[PDB]
């Protein structure tokens, strides 16, 4: 139900532009809470929660 991906590495800088987005610099390790959506995953980084593009990270 929450996808097969639990951990992922940021490939590119993602700039969060909205409150619900989880921004990161490339090389960050993201905990992936939900990977079921093909477009945007849900993650935890620095104890914050948010959405980020799935194609910006590598499992």
């Amino acid at each position: 139900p929450l996808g097969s991906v639990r951990w992922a590495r940021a490939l590119y800088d993602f700039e969060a532009l909205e409150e619900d987005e989880l921004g990161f610099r490339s090389g960050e390790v993201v905990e992936v809470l939900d990977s079921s959506n093909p477009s945007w995953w849900t993650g935890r980084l620095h104890n914050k929660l948010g959405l980020f593009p799935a194609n910006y990270v590598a499992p």
Binding site: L11, Y12, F14, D20, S39, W40, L49, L51, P53
Partner: peptide, 12 residues
Amino acid sequence: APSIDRSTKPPL
């Protein structure tokens, strides 16, 4: 870096 499409963001 890939194009970003926010039209596909699901609710958090």
